[PDB]
Design a protein around this ligand. Structure first.
Ligand SMILES: [K+]
Ligand SMILES: [Mg+2]
Ligand SMILES: [Mg+2]
Ligand SMILES: [Mg+2]
Ligand SMILES: [Mg+2]
Ligand SMILES: [Mg+2]
Ligand SMILES: [Mg+2]
Ligand SMILES: [Mg+2]
Ligand SMILES: [Mg+2]
Ligand SMILES: [Mg+2]
Ligand SMILES: [Mg+2]
Ligand SMILES: [Mg+2]
Ligand SMILES: [Mg+2]
Ligand SMILES: [Mg+2]
Ligand SMILES: [Mg+2]
Ligand SMILES: [Mg+2]
Ligand SMILES: [Mg+2]
Ligand SMILES: [Mg+2]
Ligand SMILES: [Mg+2]
Ligand SMILES: [Mg+2]
Ligand SMILES: [Mg+2]
Lengths: 258, 130, 144, 67, 185, 53
RNA sequence: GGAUAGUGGCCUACCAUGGUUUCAACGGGUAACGGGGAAUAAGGGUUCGAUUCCGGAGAGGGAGCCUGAGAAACGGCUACCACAUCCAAGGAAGGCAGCAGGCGCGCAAAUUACCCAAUCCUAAUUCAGGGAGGUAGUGACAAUAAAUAACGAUACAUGUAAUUGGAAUGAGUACAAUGUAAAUACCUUAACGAGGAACAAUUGGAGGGCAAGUCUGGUGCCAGCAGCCGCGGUAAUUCCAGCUCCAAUAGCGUAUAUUAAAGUUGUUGCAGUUAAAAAGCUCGUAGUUGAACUUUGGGCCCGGUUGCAACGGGGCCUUUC
C-alpha cells in the first residue's frame, strides 16, 4: 500500500521473541539485513528481553552507541539489526560470546560460547551461481556471497565461514547420516541425523530426521541446516540438543529438582 | 447556534467560577420545599462585549458576565445560588405586558415539531413574548 | 425414504430445499426482507422520539372496559404518526399536547398488547424526564 | 517493598546513563524549564511560515502600518 | 491500539429463577458458609461445571492417552493441592462427583472458622475483611482464597490488626483517652 | 372519556410511611433469612408458610 | 506490433468465431469491506463480526499528474462538480472517514487536558520530532474482588424485645513516603474517621407461569394493572396505598435485535388421510440414486504395545514378486 511498511504492531511480531502483550502498541520491526524479518532476532530484543542487560530501548541504544555489541565481527550499531541463526553476538565489555541458535521450543536460546570458536560461523549454501567475469560464488543462509568456492559444494550443503577473512575453511555435504538443525516449522529447534531425502521434483523436497532418541520426523528441505556428522557437531549445541521431550517427560524433568 | 442562548445577567453576591456547583432557581422557586431547582454546574464564565465573548475564569460580585453550559434548566430568568436557604430574587416586573395575540399554524403539517421548537426558543429569546 | 434425498451427493438439493423452506419462518423472512426498515415506523430502532399531537381515549377491547388514555405522536425521525400508551395510574397529566416524548415498543415485537387496540408503543419519557420518575415524586416535569 | 536498584561504577557513568527525570529526582542537574508543548508547537508552526531569518520581514513591516 | 484485555465471567445464573428447592439449598449454603449473596454460589457452581466439563472430555478419551493423562493428572493435582479433592480420590472419576460444599469448605472464610480463629462464619468474614487474618506473611482480606492445604497450618492473625500483634487498636485508643478523663484526672 | 386520569390515585388517602429500624444489608441479610427459615421458627402451619394472616 | 518494470486483449492492425450458463451464468438486492474471530451452544447448528490483529479501499465525488525506489498521495498539485472561507471586490485560499472540539442527525457514544517517561517510528540521527503512542479527565459499555456490620451481658419463649457493654474496620480526610516526566489514583500508613454504627441499598414483584398475603384502608368494568391466561361492574389474594413477605443485589427493571429453548427449518432430526401440506394424471432432460460377481482360505517364521495370554505389523511359499 503505497510503499514498504516501517511499523510492527505488537501481536504481529514473531512469537518466538516472547514479547510482552501489554508492554506497548508496537514491537521492534527488524530492519533490512542478512537473515529475514520473521527468522531474525533484533539486537534490542536480544539485549533487553534475552539478556536483561538493558531496561529500555534508550538503554539498548546507549549500549549499541559505544561499539560494545558486535555481530559477526562488525559493530552493528543498529537498534533493530536483524540478528539471526548462527550469528555471533560478542560484547567486549562483559566479554562472552553467544551463537544465536534455536532451543528445543523454537526460540532463540541464549547460548554462551567461547572466543576460540566464536571466530567462525556456519552457513547453509542457498545457491551456487556463476557471477560476473565467470567467477563462481555461493550464497549462504545469512545473505553472504563467497567467491571461488570448492567445485564440490552444492545446494543444501553447509560451509564454515571464517567471519574474520569471510572465507570458506571447510564444507559439509548434504547426505544421509549427517547432523542437521531444523530452522523452521513445527520441529523448529530440533537436531538429528538425515535418514532419507525424498525428491518431489517441482514440489518441495522432504527430508527425514532421526534424533538421538530414535524419534523420526519429516520436514521440508527449506528449513534443515546441516551442522556436521552424528556425534561431531561443528558448533556447540544448546542445553537440550534438540531432543523434543514430550510434555510428560518435560514435567518429570521439572519435578526431578525437589 | 440554535439552542444555546447564553445566560446574560449580573452577579450580586459572591464570585462565580467556571466549573462551580450552583443551584438554578426558577422564577417561581419556593425556597422552603423542592421546586424547579437544579443542582448543576457552570461550564464556562464568559465576558460579554460588543458581539465577541471572552472566556473568564472567575468574576466578582456586581459585574456583568455571560454563562456557557447552562440555561437548558430555566425558561426565562432566574438566580444561581450557592446557599441552600437562598430565596430567589425579584421577578423583574416590566411596564409592558403581552397584549397583542395571534394564532400561528404551519402551512406544512409535517413540520409541527419545528414550529413547537421555534415557539419554545422564541419564548426564551424574547423576555416579554408569551 | 423420508421424502428428502439421502444420497451422499445431494448436498446441493438439501441446502437449496432448506433455503426455500426457511422463507416460511416469520423471523427469517422479515430479517432477509428488511421489513423493519421500510415498515415498522420505528425504523429498526428500540426507541423513537416524537412530538405529542393529541390525547385520545381508546376504549379497551372486550371483555374489558376503562379507556386507556393514549396519545397520537408524530415521530421526529420520519414524520410517521403512531399511537403510544401512557402506562401508569394517571400520567396523562404528565404529558401535554406538543410535548416531546420518547416511545418504546410495547413488548410484543410490534403486536398490540393487552386489550388496547392498535397500540404497539408506550411512552417512556416526556419533555426529557422519565415517566416513571414523574409518576413517582422523584422528579418534576420541566416548565413549558 | 520491592523495587529496582542500579549502582554505577562512577558518578560520571551515572550522569551519562541515568535518565534526566531520575537525576532531577535524586538532586542532580535540574529540569530544563521549557515552554508548554502547545506553546512550543504553536511557535514552531509560526516559524514554519516565515522563510528566511525574518529581519527582512521585520524591516518590510517597519514602514507599512503606517507609511 | 494496545492488545485487547482478556476478561471472563466467573459465574452463571440458574436457568430457572424461581425454583423453590434450589432457592432453599442456596440459602442453606449461604447460611452455613456465611456468603454475601447467591453470586458466590453461582461462581462455585460455574467453576465446578468447568472442571466437570474438562474431566468429562478427558474421560471420553482412551485410557493412557497422552493428553488425557497429562491434563487429568494436572487437574487432580490442582484439586488435591487446593484440598477440594481428597487424597484417596485421585482417579479423575471422583473429580466428576465433586460438590459445591467441597469448594466452599476450602474457603478462607470457612477455614478461619474451622481453625478456631473465629466464633462463626460471619465473624470469620468480618475478621478477614478487616485485615485481621494473615495466610502466610501476607494479609489476605478476601474470604474467597482457596487455601492450598499447606497454608492451612499457617493461617494466623497478622502482626498488624491487633489480635495477633503489639498495637492495641484504634477504638481502644479513644476509649482509653476518654476513660483517663472520666477517672477525674 | 378524558379528565378522569388519576381518579383513584388522587382520591387515595395519603397514609404516611411507618419508621422501622433498618434491615442489615448483605451477608447479614442472608444470615437473617437463613435463621428465619432454617432454625424452625414458628412459621410452619403444617408444612411451611411465609406470611401471617 | 505498441505500451508496461514485466506476463497478458493491457492497447492497436489483421484473422478466426469463439468464451460463460439450470453443477444457476448474466442480471437485481445487501441497513455486505473479507478474514483471525464473537455470542449462544449435548452433538449438529443458528446469528453476528463498522471496531484493538492481518489484507483491501478511501480521504466531499470524480478524473489527470509532478517528485520520488515506492503515490494515481490528497495534513502534494491541476481541472471539473457540490459545498464553503477572507476581501479594500482587484483577488486569494480550501478539504478533521488524524487528535481534541463544534453543528447536524438521531434511541445512541467522552477533554478544544499533560507528556515523550514506556512502546516503537522517522531523520544527517545516542540528542530533535511524533494528538503514533502513553498519562490523566468523562464513563453503571462490559468484566474481577466484595463494605453496609461482628461479639458479649441481662429479661422472656436457640430466637426474640430501640434492656446494655466493650472491641474491629474502612468509606472518607490527611502529615510524609511510594507511585509518576509532573502528577492523580492504587498499595503502605502519623493523626482524625460509628450506635439509629442517619456512614440509613436499591430495583422489580407477592392469582398462575414464578418465590412471596385469601392482611387492612381506598376505588368500584371507573382509575388502572395485565409479556400471556386474566383482575377490577361495593366481599379486589391482580389496581391505588400502608404493613409484612419474596427474588436478585451495587445492581435491578424496560424496549429492540439475536441465541438456546425450536425435533416450530428437522443432515443429525419435523410433518403431509382427517390438524398446514402428495402435483388431476402420465412421459421426460438436468440432478439424485442404482442387482450380484474377479485372492479367499490355508500355514510357517520374525516380531512391537498392555498384563506365559491378548491386541496390533512385517517376510516367505501355498498356480501369486
Ligand atoms: K373484565
Ligand atoms: Mg459480513
Ligand atoms: Mg457498505
Ligand atoms: Mg471486519
Ligand atoms: Mg455501515
Ligand atoms: Mg486495518
Ligand atoms: Mg490511497
Ligand atoms: Mg466528511
Ligand atoms: Mg487523490
Ligand atoms: Mg486531513
Ligand atoms: Mg495522509
Ligand atoms: Mg476524531
Ligand atoms: Mg449504605
Ligand atoms: Mg481504600
Ligand atoms: Mg399490593
Ligand atoms: Mg408460588
Ligand atoms: Mg411441526
Ligand atoms: Mg378441513
Ligand atoms: Mg388438511
Ligand atoms: Mg436422467
Ligand atoms: Mg453394487
Amino acid at each position: 500500500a503505497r510503499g514498504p511498511k516501517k511499523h510492527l504492531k505488537r501481536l504481529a511480531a514473531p512469537h518466538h521473541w516472547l514479547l510482552d502483550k501489554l508492554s506497548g502498541c508496537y514491537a521492534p520491526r527488524p530492519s533490512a539485513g542478512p537473515h529475514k524479518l520473521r527468522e531474525s532476532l533484533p539486537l534490542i530484543v536480544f539485549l533487553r528481553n534475552r539478556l536483561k542487560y538493558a531496561l529500555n530501548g534508550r538503554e539498548v541504544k546507549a549500549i549499541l552507541m559505544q561499539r560494545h555489541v558486535k555481530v559477526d565481527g562488525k559493530v552493528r550499531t543498529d537498534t533493530t539489526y536483524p540478528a539471526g541463526f548462527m550469528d555471533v553476538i560478542t560484547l567486549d565489555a562483559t566479554n562472552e560470546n553467544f551463537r544465536l541458535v534455536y532451543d528445543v521450543k523454537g526460540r532463540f536460546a541464549v547460548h554462551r560460547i567461547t572466543d576460540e570458536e566464536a571466530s567462525y560461523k556456519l552457513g547453509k549454501v542457498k545457491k551456487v551461481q556463476l557471477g560476473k567475469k565467470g567467477v563462481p560464488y555461493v550464497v549462504t543462509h545469512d545473505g553472504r556471497t563467497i567467491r571461488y568456492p570448492d567445485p564440490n559444494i552444492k545446494v543444501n550443503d553447509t560451509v564454515k565461514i571464517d567471519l574474520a577473512s569471510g572465507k570458506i575453511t571447510d564444507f559439509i555435504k548434504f547426505d544421509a547420516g549427517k547432523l542437521v538443525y531444523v530452522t523452521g516449522g513445527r520441529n523448529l529447534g530440533r537436531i538429528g541425523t538425515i535418514v532419507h531425502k525424498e525428491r518431489h521434483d517441482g514440489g518441495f523436497d522432504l527430508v527425514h530426521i532421526k534424533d538421538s532418541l530414535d524419534n523420526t520426523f519429516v520436514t521440508r528441505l527449506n528449513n534443515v541446516f546441516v551442522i556436521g556428522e552424528q556425534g561431531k557437531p561443528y558448533i556447540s549445541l544448546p542445553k537440550g540438543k534438540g531432543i523434543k521431550l514430550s510434555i510428560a517427560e518435560e514435567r518429570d524433568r521439572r519435578r526431578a529438582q525437589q | 447556534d440554535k439552542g444555546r442562548f447564553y445566560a446574560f445577567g449580573r452577579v450580586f453576591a459572591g464570585t462565580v467560577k467556571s466549573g462551580q456547583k450552583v443551584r438554578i432557581q426558577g422564577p417561581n422557586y419556593v425556597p422552603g420545599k423542592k421546586d424547579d431547582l437544579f443542582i448543576k454546574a457552570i461550564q464556562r464564565v464568559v465576558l460579554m462585549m460588543g458581539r465577541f465573548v471572552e472566556p473568564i475564569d472567575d468574576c466578582p460580585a456586581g459585574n456583568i458576565i455571560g454563562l456557557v453550559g447552562i440555561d437548558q434548566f430555566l425558561l426565562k430568568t432566574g438566580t444561581l445560588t450557592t446557599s441552600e436557604t437562598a430565596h430567589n430574587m425579584k421577578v423583574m416586573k416590566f411596564s409592558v405586558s403581552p397584549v397583542v395575540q395571534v394564532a400561528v399554524e404551519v402551512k406544512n403539517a409535517n413540520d409541527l415539531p419545528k414550529l413547537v421548537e421555534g415557539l419554545k426558543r422564541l419564548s426564551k429569546s424574547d423576555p416579554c413574548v408569551l | 425414504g423420508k421424502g428428502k434425498p439421502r444420497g451422499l451427493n445431494s448436498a446441493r438439493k438439501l441446502r437449496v430445499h432448506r433455503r426455500n423452506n426457511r422463507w416460511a419462518e416469520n423471523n427469517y423472512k422479515k430479517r432477509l426482507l428488511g421489513t423493519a426498515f421500510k415498515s415498522s415506523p420505528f425504523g429498526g430502532s428500540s426507541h423513537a422520539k416524537g412530538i405529542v399531537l393529541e390525547k385520545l381515549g381508546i376504549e379497551s377491547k372486550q371483555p374489558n372496559s376503562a379507556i386507556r388514555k393514549c396519545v397520537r405522536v408524530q415521530l421526529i425521525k420520519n414524520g410517521k404518526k403512531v399511537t403510544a400508551f401512557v402506562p401508569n395510574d394517571g400520567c396523562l397529566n404528565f404529558v401535554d399536547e406538543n410535548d416531546e416524548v420518547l416511545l418504546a415498543g410495547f413488548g410484543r415485537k410490534g403486536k398490540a398488547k393487552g386489550d388496547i387496540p392498535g397500540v404497539r408503543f408506550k411512552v417512556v419519557k416526556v419533555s426529557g424526564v422519565s415517566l416513571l420518575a414523574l409518576w413517582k415524586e422523584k422528579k418534576e416535569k420541566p416548565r413549558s | 517493598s520491592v523495587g529496582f536498584g542500579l549502582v554505577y561504577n562512577s558518578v560520571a557513568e551515572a550522569k551519562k546513563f541515568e535518565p534526566t527525570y531520575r537525576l532531577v529526582r535524586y538532586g542532580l542537574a535540574e529540569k530544563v524549564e521549557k515552554a508548554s508543548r502547545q506553546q512550543r508547537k504553536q511557535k514552531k508552526n509560526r516559524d514554519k511560515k516565515i522563510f528566511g531569518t525574518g529581519k527582512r520581514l521585520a524591516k518590510k513591516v517597519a514602514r507599512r502600518n503606517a507609511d | 491500539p494496545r492488545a485487547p484485555r482478556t476478561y471472563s465471567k466467573t459465574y452463571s445464573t440458574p436457568k430457572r429463577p424461581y425454583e423453590s428447592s434450589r432457592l432453599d439449598a442456596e440459602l442453606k449454603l449461604a447460611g452455613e458458609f456465611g456468603l454475601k449473596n447467591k453470586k458466590e454460589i453461582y461462581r462455585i457452581s460455574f467453576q465446578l461445571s468447568k472442571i466437570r466439563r474438562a474431566a468429562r472430555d478427558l474421560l471420553t478419551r482412551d485410557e493412557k492417552d497422552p493428553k488425557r493423562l497429562f491434563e487429568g493428572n494436572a487437574l487432580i493435582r490442582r484439586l488435591v493441592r487446593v484440598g477440594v479433592l481428597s487424597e484417596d480420590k485421585k482417579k479423575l472419576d471422583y473429580v466428576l462427583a465433586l460438590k459445591v460444599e467441597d469448594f466452599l469448605e476450602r474457603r478462607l472464610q470457612t477455614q478461619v472458622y474451622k481453625l478456631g480463629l473465629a466464633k462463626s462464619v460471619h465473624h470469620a468474614r468480618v475478621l478477614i475483611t478487616q485485615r485481621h487474618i494473615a495466610v502466610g506473611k501476607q494479609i489476605v482480606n478476601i474470604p474467597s482464597f482457596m487455601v492450598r492445604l499447606d497454608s492451612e497450618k499457617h493461617i494466623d492473625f497478622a502482626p498488624t490488626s491487633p489480635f495477633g500483634g503489639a498495637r492495641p487498636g484504634r477504638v481502644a485508643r479513644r476509649n482509653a483517652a476518654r476513660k483517663a478523663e472520666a477517672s477525674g484526672e | 372519556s378524558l379528565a378522569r386520569a388519576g381518579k383513584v390515585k388522587s382520591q387515595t388517602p395519603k397514609v404516611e410511611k411507618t419508621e422501622k429500624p433498618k434491615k442489615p444489608k448483605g451477608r447479614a441479610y442472608k444470615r437473617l433469612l437463613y435463621t428465619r427459615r432454617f432454625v424452625n421458627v414458628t412459621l410452619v402451619n403444617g408444612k411451611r408458610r411465609m406470611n401471617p394472616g
